[PDB]
Design a protein around this nucleic acid. Structure first.
Ligand SMILES: N=C(N)NCC(=O)N(O)[C@@H](CCC(N)=O)C(=O)NC[C@H]1O[C@@H](c2c[nH]c(=O)[nH]c2=O)[C@H](O)[C@@H]1O
Ligand SMILES: [Mg+2]
Ligand SMILES: [Mg+2]
Ligand SMILES: [Mg+2]
Ligand SMILES: [Zn+2]
Lengths: 14, 221, 111, 113, 1111
DNA sequence: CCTGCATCCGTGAATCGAG
DNA sequence: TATAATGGGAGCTGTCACGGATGCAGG
């Protein structure tokens, strides 16, 4: 949905 | 953010700098990685903003110059209570800077504007709709050019075929090439001075034809 | 020949490249000083065509004598500048991307 | 069916997306140029990120941005938010916006002149 | 001349300052004349206070100040500068740890100042900031269009500040709350506020079957913090539910005074609606470590009480002017000032954490550019920032009283709907029900009523006379729409003897609805009939006798009236004609009592009671925005002793202080040989002889000599390949001399530019070689006269570079402007119109002998068609003609107030008195009755217009009382077979003239991409042949005419060049080729990766690009 | 498991002028 | 090329009525 928020989620995993 | 590149564009460019930082890092120095990474990250981001922002791409050093001119003019406008003159900025810039060079620099930094720029408070009009095409020939131009070629051929028929061919080869009406006297003499079979003589006679005949007929005069533009 | 029909169809990648007169490698437009088309840019003359009629970029070939002749030094063909209206370019993507028309037009054709 | 996915994105001829110098010596250009520059930038960066090698997280985001750029070119505002010029709220004019619409190529220039 | 007036109504208060909505608003937002220490918190001051201080080093705000304009007004109009003032700000940088305090005054740029009349100057152009109308902030309850018994609750803050909140009862029983396109149970939000099941049970328990849906055991099972985290997971999915993060978002969304802001008006509206009081302008607060409620509980209370059917709870009309407010110039500029100041604050916060954490000053830390850009944006490319209408003084006067529903935060044209476009009962006295554009903006753009003003909250208030018992007090009370709905307000024309009500049953209003009521039940009374309509609508006499539609036309067209050189005030006025030229700064008056020293066309010098000598420079022949010449004319002589507020110099469109939008002409209402067929108008040549309807128009012609990479552009008298006959009126510098006459094709300013580099075609090379003249290095690019224009050069402004005082935009060497004016007489095609809505064009200019004339030999000026009257239903011009006729022979003017004006019997009386002058002169000169007058009388008594048997003088009087006289056809000498209505009518010459409009094009400029002809007269463009015009040709079956338009006459390049070549060669046009615009379509479709191929019947591809697109 | 109704998203919304 | 720094920021809320696709509970 939101590219910025999605990338922020993919970053919070590590 | 807000410097011409999107948020994600900046992040990815900082990721490039992050990669550069990782490969150039030395752990023996006991420095926390964040310290050495930050430098390369900022460096990659700034390089990206300097390169990708302007539609008309401008070298990084020239951008630093323009931005230096921005901070200079803003410093002066903040102290003088008004917008600075070209000469005032030229002073505060130091040596090598006059009003002329400042104005030139500003002219370079000018960015293009969108052709889809709205005209009016409705959406039925665009900016590019009011811009004529300067390249493609108007029907008047093409017609005039054709009339010039026809009138010139009508003028070259008042000569013989030989003395007109010398001129057609000399100025490049035929084949589209201007020849020296040696080539035209190598073709017709006479000496170069004979060719220059024929071209003098032909031009002089065309002068007398022009003085009498008054036809080609209007095409002088 | 007279036109009696008009066909519309999907363009194959090879057909897209067949249309293209060159790949646009750099997102440059024109030089910030010379105001001339930057090489391998969106306005590059070597790809789309000459700005001046029957004249190449560096000005080595200025006439209609040589037509179809590609300048060796500059790299631009000498023809009518009208070709810059009709000549397609292309961009080879690293990862193949989906044409949004066939993705978002309900009911989705790909879906 | 695999032609519905683009390996090579076409480029419209320069004169149909012109960059011209107006009366005052200033420059004016089409939004398609900014769109294509978006595409080339994100594409070239992806090719570099692949060449030097990068974690799949970074490559993923770069790919997702590439699709966003392709969509922006073909049909702006179609998927999610429209791409705009900095400082402006005005969405760029995409190929879909040029063809379709009441101001489109069909209604404005083809069915009337 | 004598000025006789009518009416029994004595209006107590005079009309308020007409430009007050501009000046008093902007000044209130600035407080520049207010000492900083005594400044209140509004506008610019409120912006500084709301944006300051900056948390994280602490930068604090002290006070601001505004210097004087760097240039005067007329100097800004001249040099294309902006009328503005320097803005300085006192700031003290305070370190929250060290305690270091560094104080300095930073410069934030300039702020545009408003002129006296209420307009602005943006880069050398007068601009009017139009007020905006929008839904007032507060809490409204609108019925749900889906469920009849259920209602929608809406919580609305100021535009751009905070989201809208929707409280709705779902079919599943639970109350929902909608914020930023997100719905959730309101129960959770209530829990975060610190509410419990106890508090909600005792408070809302009055209404059963409702609060049980608000009851949820799983909600009270968690603490306020847990519920807060739960809510953050609802509003912000994917974002980590950190406590302080959730606090920050929710607080910023609701309780934050800086982010979320109700209107001070909306604050009061919410207080009165919910019967409570609000401490701040936020829906909630952050106090003592948690969230405390303010708005949500009383709103939910009212909502449930509304659904249950509990008395004392109503829905809200959103078109009600008690729920609709006005954002004036001051508030609009303030809001944009707030945005720009907020961006500057972001720059401050950014630069504090960067650079030196030790050595920083307020000067270093401040970037003024965001603020400058924001202000400059609002004053330039904003919609509400419009080009000032300087046609006539009334134009700009109305322009400043315009009200728009559009612009930022307003309505989109598609988002409109005609619910808001209609007239409301609350528009009474506030917004004019007549004045509006008949375009797409109808209902959206309106004008403010005369007696109406806007209060501090933003609502429109109207004056009303206090009535207690039968006595009407001279005091006046300005009321809002909500307040007006409380009382019973009678009519202004209700009978009053002294201060006492006379009538037994008066006509009154209760909440808009008319009611016949007793004088004991009358609480208030209309001040004047004039308060119901706008200023322009007040300038129309006999308004009550006109249809509302043509009244709209009259009000709109008076704005379009061009100031004539012989312009005169109307014979029949309404009384506001002087006041208009008063509030508008067209005229000129004396400040105090005194005597006149000097009188000139350039200046007027006056010595006052003070003894001080004041000199007034006069504006003469200055070009306005529309081209109408604005000049002031002296009306006093040397030594004239004047008083306070006496006329010194008449401005544009003004006669002796009164407004002159047209001229009083002798009209005749009769058909005339079909020349007045369908609204057309026939005029006399005499109107041109004595220069009636003649006006001066000026046009501004600019040219720029810039720096090119191919060489400089030089403005000089030297132009290659030109005849001396063409260089006649130029001076030695290339500029045309002042006072010369210029025609289409002539050169205003000569300029040369170096040719673009190109191989001269072999034909040109040979041509140069033959004529023995080398090609000139430069090329002629001269500012010439556009086709259909011209006049006399009155002024030349030349700006350069290197010379003092002037510096142009980068690249430009010198800017030269030429001012060419012209006096325009009335010609066939120009548009004439009156105040009653009657409009038309001049179709014929007859010689004076062809003109229908009076028995005494006086020819009429204008011939109007009677057919235009009945269908259009505007009888005002008829009465204007009657009273104009009586005033024509009596030689006196009149004042007829709207709805209070003169009535028929009085007009009959004045007509009779005029008849005595008419016929009494004749019979005294020894002239009996004409034989043609006898025949006319015969057909008149057959018409039943006069009583049979009476003497001709008695019959001619009977006709004259009806407004009809005997007319003689100038062509025949025979009379018209019937009596015709003749009299003086006030007719205006509108801005729409054939000189500005007429255009024709053979060939010209073509667009870039489409390569089709441009559009408009200015660009020398072609006429648009739309798809409807295509249909017209198709329906006809004219294929080759349509194919012409689609190819040769527009888009086909080769075809049109060969076409033009064919016509000038006498040869027939060539077969049309395939259009370029289709080729554009093909390639644009290829850019979409779609293959488009043209084929033959063999299904073999056909190349329309002729090999140019194939490798 | 398959029909029917509620509901979602995307698409339209007159012409020509000027601006 | 080196103190250490490690999940964003502003939303636009007063059109409307249509076709068609998605999804839901109900027989
Ligand atoms: N500024 C505008 N549009 N004024 C409208 C106007 O003066 N008219 O006379 C309008 C409507 C009457 C009115 N005032 O409401 C009118 O009837 N003009 C005559 C013709 O002009 C055409 C027309 C007028 N106004 C429009 O908005 N669209 C139209 O197509 C119609 O074909 C119409 O038959
Ligand atoms: Mg210097
Ligand atoms: Mg504007
Ligand atoms: Mg439906
Ligand atoms: Zn070359």
């Amino acid at each position: 949905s939101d590219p910025v928020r999605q990338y922020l989620h993919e970053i919070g995993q590590v | 953010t807000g410097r011409g590149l999107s948020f994600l564009d900046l992040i990815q460019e900082g990721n490039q700098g992050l990669i550069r930082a990782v490969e150039k890092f030395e752990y023996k120095r006991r420095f926390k990685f964040s310290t050495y990474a930050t430098w390369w990250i900022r460096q990659a981001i700034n390089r990206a903003i300097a390169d990708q922002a302007r539609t008309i791409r401008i070298p990084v050093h020239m951008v630093e110059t323009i931005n230096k001119l921005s901070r200079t003019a803003r410093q002066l406008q903040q102290e003088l209570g008004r917008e600075p003159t070209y000469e005032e900025i030229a002073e505060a810039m130091g040596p090598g800077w006059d009003a002329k060079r400042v104005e030139e620099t500003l002219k370079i930094a000018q960015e293009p504007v969108s052709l889809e720029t709205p005209i009016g408070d409705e959406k039925d009009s665009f900016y590019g709709d009011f811009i004529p095409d300067e390249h493609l020939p108007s029907p008047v131009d093409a017609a005039t050019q054709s009339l010039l070629s026809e009138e010139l051929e009508k003028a070259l028929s008042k000569l013989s075929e030989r003395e007109a061919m010398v001129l057609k080869l000399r100025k490049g009406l035929i084949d589209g090439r201007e020849h020296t006297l040696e080539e035209v003499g190598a073709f017709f079979g006479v000496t170069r001075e004979r060719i220059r003589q024929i071209e003098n006679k032909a031009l002089r005949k065309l002068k007398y034809h022009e003085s009498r007929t008054r036809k080609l005069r209007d095409f002088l533009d | 020949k007279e036109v009696r029909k008009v066909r519309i169809a999907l363009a194959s990648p090879e057909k897209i490249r067949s249309w293209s007169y060159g790949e646009v490698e750099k997102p440059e437009t024109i030089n910030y000083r010379t105001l001339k088309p930057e090489r391998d840019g969106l306005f590059d003359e070597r790809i789309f065509g000459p700005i001046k009629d029957y004249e190449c970029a560096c000005g080595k070939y200025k006439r209609q004598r040589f037509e179809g002749k590609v300048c060796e030094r500059c790299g631009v063909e000498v023809t009518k500048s009208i070709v810059r209206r009709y000549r397609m370019g292309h961009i080879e993507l690293a990862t193949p991307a989906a044409h949004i028309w066939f993705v978002k037009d309900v009911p989705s054709k790909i879906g | 069916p695999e032609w519905m996915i683009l390996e090579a994105v076409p480029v419209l001829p320069p004169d149909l997306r012109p960059m011209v110098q107006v009366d005052g010596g200033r420059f004016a250009t089409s939004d398609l140029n900014d769109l294509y520059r978006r595409l080339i930038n994100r594409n070239n960066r992806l090719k570099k990120l692949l060449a030097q090698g990068a974690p799949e997280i970074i490559i993923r985001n770069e790919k997702r941005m590439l699709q966003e750029a392709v969509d922006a070119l073909l049909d702006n505002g179609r998927r999610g938010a429209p791409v705009t010029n900095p400082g402006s709220d005005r969405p760029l004019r995409s190929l879909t916006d040029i063809l379709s619409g009441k101001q489109g190529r069909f209604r404005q220039n083809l069915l009337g002149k | 001349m004598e000025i006789k007036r009518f009416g029994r109504i004595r209006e107590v208060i005079p009309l308020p300052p007409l430009t007050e909505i501009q000046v008093e608003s902007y000044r209130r937002a600035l407080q520049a004349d207010v000492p900083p220490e005594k400044r209140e918190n509004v506008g610019i001051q409120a912006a500084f206070r709301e944006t300051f201080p900056i948390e994280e080093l602490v930068l604090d705000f002290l006070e601001y100040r505004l210097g004087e304009p760097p240039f005067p007004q007329d100097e800004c109009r001249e040099k294309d500068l902006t009328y503005q003032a320097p803005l300085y700000a006192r700031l003290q940088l305070i370190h929250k740890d060290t305690g270091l305090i560094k104080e300095d005054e930073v410069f934030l740029g300039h702020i545009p100042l408003m002129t006296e009349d209420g307009s602005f100057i943006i880069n050398g152009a007068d601009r009017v900031i139009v007020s905006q109308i929008h839904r007032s902030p507060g809490v409204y309850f609108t019925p749900d269009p889906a469920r009849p018994g259920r209602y929608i609750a809406s919580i609305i803050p100021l535009p751009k500040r905070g989201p809208w909140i929707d409280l709705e009862v779902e079919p599943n029983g639970v109350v929902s709350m909608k914020v930023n396109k997100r719905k959730f149970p309101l129960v959770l939000l209530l829990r975060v506020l610190g509410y419990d099941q106890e508090t909600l049970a005792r408070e809302l328990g009055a209404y059963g079957e409702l609060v049980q849906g608000l009851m949820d055991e799983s909600v009270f099972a968690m603490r306020p913090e847990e519920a807060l985290i739960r809510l953050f997971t609802l509003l912000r999915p994917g974002d980590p539910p950190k406590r302080d993060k959730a606090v920050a978002y929710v607080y910023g969304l609701i309780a934050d005074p800086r982010r979320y802001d109700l209107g001070e008006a909306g604050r009061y509206k919410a207080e009165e609606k919910l019967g409570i009081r609000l401490s701040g302008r936020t829906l909630a607060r952050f106090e003592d470590g948690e969230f405390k409620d303010e708005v949500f509980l009383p709103t939910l209370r009212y909502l449930f009480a509304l659904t249950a059917g509990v008395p004392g709870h109503e829905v809200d009309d959103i078109d009600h002017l008690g729920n609709r407010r006005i954002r004036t110039v001051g508030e609009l500029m303030t809001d944009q000032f707030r945005v720009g100041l907020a961006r500057l604050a972001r720059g401050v916060r950014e630069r504090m954490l960067m650079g030196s954490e030790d050595s920083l000053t307020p000067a270093k830390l401040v970037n003024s550019r965001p603020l400058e850009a924001a202000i400059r944006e609002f004053f330039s490319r904003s919609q509400l920032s419009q080009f000032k209408d300087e046609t006539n003084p009334l134009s700009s006067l109305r322009h400043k009283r315009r009200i728009s529903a559009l612009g930022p935060g307003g309505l989109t044209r598609e988002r409109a709907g005609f619910d808001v476009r209609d007239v409301h009962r609350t528009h009474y006295g506030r917004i004019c029900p007549v004045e509006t554009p008949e375009g797409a903006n109808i209902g959206l753009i309106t004008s403010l009523a005369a007696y109406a003003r806007v209060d501090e909250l933003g609502f429109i208030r109207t004056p009303y006379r206090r009535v207690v018992g039968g006595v009407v007090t001279d005091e006046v009370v300005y009321m809002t729409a909500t307040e007006e709905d409380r009382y019973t307000i009678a009519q202004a024309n209700t009978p009053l003897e002294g201060n006492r009500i006379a009538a037994e049953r008066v006509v009154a209003r209760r909440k808009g609805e008319p009611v016949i009521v007793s004088p004991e039940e009358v609480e208030f009374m209309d001040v004047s009939p004039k308060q119901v309509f706008s200023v322009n609508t007040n300038l129309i006499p006999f308004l009550e006798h006109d249809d509302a539609n043509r009244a709209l036309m009259g009000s709109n067209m008076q704005t379009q009236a061009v100031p004539l050189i012989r312009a005169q005030a109307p014979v029949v006025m309404t009384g506001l004609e002087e006041r208009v030229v008063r509030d508008s700064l067209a005229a000129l008056y004396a400040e105090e009592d005194g005597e006149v020293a000097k009188v000139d066309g350039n200046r007027i010098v006056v010595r006052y009671e003070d003894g001080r000598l004041v000199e007034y420079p006069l504006r003469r022949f200055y070009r306005s925005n529309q081209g109408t010449a604005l000049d002031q004319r002296p009306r006093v002589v040397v030594g004239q002793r004047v008083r306070k507020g006496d006329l010194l110099a008449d401005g544009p469109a003004s006669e002796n202080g009164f407004l002159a939008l047209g001229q009083n002409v002798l009209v005749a209402i009769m058909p005339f040989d079909g020349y007045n067929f369908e609204d057309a108008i026939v005029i006399s040549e005499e109107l041109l002889k004595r220069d009636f309807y003649t006006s001066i128009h000026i046009e501004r012609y600019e040219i720029e000599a810039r720096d090119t990479k191919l060489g400089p552009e030089r403005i000089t008298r030297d132009i290659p390949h030109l005849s001396e006959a063409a260089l006649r009126d130029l001076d030695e510098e290339g500029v045309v001399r002042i006072g010369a006459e210029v025609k289409p094709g002539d050169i205003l300013v000569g300029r040369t530019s170096f040719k673009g580099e190109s191989e001269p075609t072999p034909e040109e090379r040979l041509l140069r070689s033959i004529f023995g003249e080398k090609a000139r290095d430069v090329k002629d690019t001269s500012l010439r006269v556009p086709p259909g224009e011209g006049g006399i050069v009155v002024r030349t402004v030349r700006l350069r570079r290197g010379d003092p005082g002037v510096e142009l935009k980068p690249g430009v060497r010198e800017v030269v402007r030429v001012y060419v004016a012209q006096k325009r007489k009335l010609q066939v095609g120009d548009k004439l119109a009156n105040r009653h809505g009657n409009k038309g064009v001049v179709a014929k200019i007859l010689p004076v002998e062809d003109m229908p004339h009076l028995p005494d030999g006086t020819p009429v000026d204008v011939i109007l068609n009677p057919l235009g009257v009945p269908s259009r239903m505007n009888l005002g011009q008829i009465l204007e003609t009657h009273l104009g006729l009586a005033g024509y022979f009596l030689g006196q003017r009149y004042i007829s107030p709207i709805f209070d004006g003169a009535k028929e019997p009085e007009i009959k009386e004045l007509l009779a008195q005029a008849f005595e002058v008419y016929f009494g002169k004749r019979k005294g000169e020894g002239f009996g009755v004409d034989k043609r007058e006898v025949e006319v009388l015969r057909r008149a008594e057959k018409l039943g217009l006069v009583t049979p048997g009476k003497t001709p003088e008695e019959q001619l009087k009977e006709l004259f009382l009806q407004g009809k006289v005997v007319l003689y056809d100038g062509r025949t000498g025979e009379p018209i077979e019937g009596p015709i209505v003749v009299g003086q009518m006030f007719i205006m010459k509108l801005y729409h003239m054939v000189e500005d409009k007429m255009h024709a094009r053979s060939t010209g400029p073509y667009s870039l991409i489409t390569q089709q002809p441009l559009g408009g007269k200015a660009q020398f463009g072609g006429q648009r042949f739309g798809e409807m015009e295509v249909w017209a040709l198709e329906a006809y079956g004219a294929a080759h005419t349509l194919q012409e338009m689609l190819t040769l006459k527009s888009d086909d390049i080769e075809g049109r060049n060969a076409a033009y070549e064919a016509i000038i060669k006498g040869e027939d046009v060539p077969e049309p080729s395939v259009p370029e615009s289709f080729r554009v379509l093909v390639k644009e479709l290829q850019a979409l990766a779609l293959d488009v191929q043209t084929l033959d019947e063999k299904d073999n591809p056909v190349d329309i690009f002729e090999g140019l697109a194939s490798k």
